[PDB]
Design an enzyme around this catalytic site. Structure first.
Site, PDB file in Angstrom:
ATOM      1  N   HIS A 176       0.856  -1.186   0.000  1.00 21.48           N
ATOM      2  CA  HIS A 176       0.000   0.000   0.000  1.00 21.48           C
ATOM      3  C   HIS A 176       0.891   1.234   0.000  1.00 21.48           C
ATOM      4  CE1 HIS A 176      -3.064   2.825   0.444  1.00 21.48           C
ATOM      5  NE2 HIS A 176      -3.844   2.226   1.328  1.00 21.48           N
ATOM      6  N   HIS A 179      -2.760   6.861  -1.181  1.00 23.21           N
ATOM      7  CA  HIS A 179      -3.785   7.483  -0.325  1.00 23.21           C
ATOM      8  C   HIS A 179      -3.235   8.295   0.848  1.00 23.21           C
ATOM      9  CE1 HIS A 179      -6.459   4.084  -2.070  1.00 23.21           C
ATOM     10  NE2 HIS A 179      -6.431   5.128  -2.878  1.00 23.21           N
ATOM     11  N   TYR A 181      -0.763   7.566   2.967  1.00 23.58           N
ATOM     12  CA  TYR A 181      -0.283   6.804   4.115  1.00 23.58           C
ATOM     13  C   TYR A 181       1.248   6.856   4.145  1.00 23.58           C
ATOM     14  CZ  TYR A 181      -5.208   5.866   4.824  1.00 23.58           C
ATOM     15  OH  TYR A 181      -6.557   6.008   5.039  1.00 23.58           O
TER      16      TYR A 181
HETATM   17  C1  LIG Z   1     -14.643   1.748   2.682  1.00 21.22           C
HETATM   18  C2  LIG Z   1     -13.386   1.806   1.845  1.00 21.22           C
HETATM   19  C3  LIG Z   1     -12.224   1.202   2.318  1.00 21.22           C
HETATM   20  C4  LIG Z   1     -11.060   1.243   1.541  1.00 21.22           C
HETATM   21  N1  LIG Z   1      -9.907   0.655   2.018  1.00 21.22           N
HETATM   22  C5  LIG Z   1      -8.756   0.644   1.246  1.00 21.22           C
HETATM   23  C6  LIG Z   1      -7.601   0.019   1.719  1.00 21.22           C
HETATM   24  O1  LIG Z   1      -7.598  -0.589   2.809  1.00 21.22           O
HETATM   25  N2  LIG Z   1      -6.462   0.046   0.941  1.00 21.22           N
HETATM   26  C7  LIG Z   1      -6.460   0.720  -0.268  1.00 21.22           C
HETATM   27  O2  LIG Z   1      -5.451   0.734  -0.974  1.00 21.22           O
HETATM   28  N3  LIG Z   1      -7.601   1.346  -0.715  1.00 21.22           N
HETATM   29  C8  LIG Z   1      -8.756   1.313   0.031  1.00 21.22           C
HETATM   30  N4  LIG Z   1      -9.893   1.934  -0.442  1.00 21.22           N
HETATM   31  C9  LIG Z   1      -9.881   2.581  -1.808  1.00 21.22           C
HETATM   32  C10 LIG Z   1     -10.451   1.511  -2.774  1.00 21.22           C
HETATM   33  O3  LIG Z   1      -9.618   0.355  -2.870  1.00 21.22           O
HETATM   34  C11 LIG Z   1     -10.722   2.005  -4.200  1.00 21.22           C
HETATM   35  O4  LIG Z   1      -9.486   2.381  -4.771  1.00 21.22           O
HETATM   36  C12 LIG Z   1     -11.710   3.176  -4.200  1.00 21.22           C
HETATM   37  O5  LIG Z   1     -12.908   2.794  -3.536  1.00 21.22           O
HETATM   38  C13 LIG Z   1     -12.094   3.689  -5.586  1.00 21.22           C
HETATM   39  O6  LIG Z   1     -12.648   2.634  -6.352  1.00 21.22           O
HETATM   40  P1  LIG Z   1     -14.233   2.458  -6.591  1.00 21.22           P
HETATM   41  O7  LIG Z   1     -14.783   3.608  -7.399  1.00 21.22           O
HETATM   42  O8  LIG Z   1     -14.400   1.162  -7.341  1.00 21.22           O
HETATM   43  O9  LIG Z   1     -14.887   2.417  -5.224  1.00 21.22           O
HETATM   44  C14 LIG Z   1     -11.059   1.882   0.309  1.00 21.22           C
HETATM   45  C15 LIG Z   1     -12.219   2.489  -0.147  1.00 21.22           C
HETATM   46  C16 LIG Z   1     -13.382   2.453   0.611  1.00 21.22           C
HETATM   47  C17 LIG Z   1     -14.616   3.121   0.084  1.00 21.22           C
END
Ligand SMILES: Cc1cc2nc3c(=O)[nH]c(=O)nc-3n(C[C@H](O)[C@H](O)[C@H](O)COP(=O)(O)O)c2cc1C
Ligand SMILES: NC(=O)[C@H]1C=CCN([C@@H]2O[C@H](COP(=O)(O)OP(=O)(O)OC[C@H]3O[C@H](n4cnc5c(N)ncnc54)[C@H](O)[C@H]3O)[C@@H](O)[C@H]2O)C1
EC number: 1.3.1.42
Length: 356
Positions: A176, A179, A181
């Site tokens: 990871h 975002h 982090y």
């Molecule tokens: C509730 C939630 C939890 C997420 N947790 C992670 C995570 O643990 N690690 C990560 O890299 N991205 C995390 N994301 C980002 C998602 O993996 C994804 O990149 C993001 O939701 C955009 O894609 P989508 O339009 O298909 O939702 C999270 C997103 C959401 C909404």
């Protein structure tokens, strides 16, 4: 439908290109993977489908959300093993995402209430708030800027966690680096104000992610290592003055790791905010997973136009356990409920979203 042509992710032959994106859901009470996680991933697993777990802690100091699973203790390894076994019995491939939040934490999440660690002492600004264990939102504290000895210790935490993931039966791990982090706190010039060899130039800012990836590649093999980055997402005050340059600089180092190791990584996984995606794909020598706002139609288009090899879905996978089949049939999708993204119930808003 191009999403249903097979794809060789190195030694893993996938039957289709729809990927479960990593999603923190906070059901892993007290950092132990719970049976509920097994049910959740099992519902979403398909034969030949690829799953990426929620972010998983690499050390006692790596968390900034409540009830996120760890993989740094032997107890956590034993419990993950039961989850991996259930997913493998459905024929899926599963990677564990290794996650350190850096300064995106709070005293409540740190051993002895210590300050979180970062590249910098700058806190996330007051425009962002942290979810607290009681469901309220709190203030991000000032982090502690780590020296280079401690950087090497954090790299070792990634290495041990990668070995623990293999011991649990995971097919691989994902780093990871997205975002805002810990890794992103080194990559982004809006955060990294260091004047040592980990700050300043693109090469210095890419040193940490390079060392993390190299450590896990040496430990488990490049084909079991995926890398996730988000140069253009400014979540948690994580902006770069030149996101495209930064993204290309990271790709450069990944291409070099592959040459020096004589093997390709499992993939590069890039997520965008709600031409940059194609530019990084074109620069990277290997498998590319695109992420962020993809629909059925946009995922089909991305694979058909060569913009990506695999497409990961997040929010729609929360509410559609059979998302893969719904994409195959062009069946209507279920709405998701944001209120239960991060709650602790093992069923409500977690495994009770219905199948077709
Ligand atoms: C509730 C939630 C939890 C997420 N947790 C992670 C995570 O643990 N690690 C990560 O890299 N991205 C995390 N994301 C980002 C998602 O993996 C994804 O990149 C993001 O939701 C955009 O894609 P989508 O339009 O298909 O939702 C999270 C997103 C959401 C909404
Ligand atoms: N562990 C992680 O990487 C994820 C944890 C939480 C949410 N993830 C991402 O945070 C960013 C902002 O989340 P959102 O837009 O939902 O804002 P909130 O403050 O969660 O409401 C998005 O790019 C989203 O995909 C990141």
């Amino acid at each position: 439908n191009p999403l249903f042509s097979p794809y060789k992710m190195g030694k893993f032959n996938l039957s289709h290109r729809v990927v479960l994106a990593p999603m923190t859901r906070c059901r892993a009470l007290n950092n132990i993977p719970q049976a509920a996680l097994g049910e959740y991933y099992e519902q979403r697993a398909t034969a030949g489908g690829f799953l990426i777990t929620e972010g998983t802690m690499i050390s006692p100091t790596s968390a900034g959300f409540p009830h996120v699973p760890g993989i740094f203790t032997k107890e956590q390894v034993r419990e993950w093993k039961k989850i991996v076994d259930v997913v493998h019995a459905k024929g899926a491939v599963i990677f564990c995402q290794l996650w350190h939040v850096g300064r995106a934490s709070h005293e409540v999440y740190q051993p002895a209430g210590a300050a979180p660690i970062s590249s910098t002492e700058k806190p996330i600004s007051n425009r962002w708030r942290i979810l607290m264990p009681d469901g309220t939102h709190g203030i991000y504290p000032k982090p502690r800027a780590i020296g280079t000895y401690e950087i090497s210790q954090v790299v070792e935490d990634y290495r041990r966690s990668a070995l623990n993931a293999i011991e649990a039966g995971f097919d691989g791990i994902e780093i990871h680096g997205a975002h805002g982090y810990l890794i992103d706190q080194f990559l982004k010039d809006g955060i990294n104000d260091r004047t040592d060899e980990y700050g300043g130039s693109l090469a210095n800012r890419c040193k940490f992610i390079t060392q993390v990836v190299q450590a896990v590649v040496s430990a488990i093999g490049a084909d079991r290592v995926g890398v996730r980055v988000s140069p253009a997402i400014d979540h948690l005050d994580a902006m770069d003055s030149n996101p495209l340059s930064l993204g290309l600089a990271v790709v450069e180092r990944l291409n070099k790791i592959q040459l020096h190791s004589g093997s390709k990584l499992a993939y590069l996984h890039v997520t965008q905010p709600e031409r940059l995606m194609r530019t990084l794909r074109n620069a990277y020598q290997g498998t590319f997973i695109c992420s962020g706002g993809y629909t059925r139609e946009l995922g089909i288009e991305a694979v058909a136009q060569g913009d990506a090899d695999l497409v990961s879905y997040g929010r729609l996978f929360i509410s559609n356990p059979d998302l893969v089949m719904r994409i195959k049939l062009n069946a209507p999708l279920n709405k998701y409920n944001r209120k239960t993204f991060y709650t602790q119930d093992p069923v409500v808003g977690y495994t009770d979203y219905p199948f077709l």
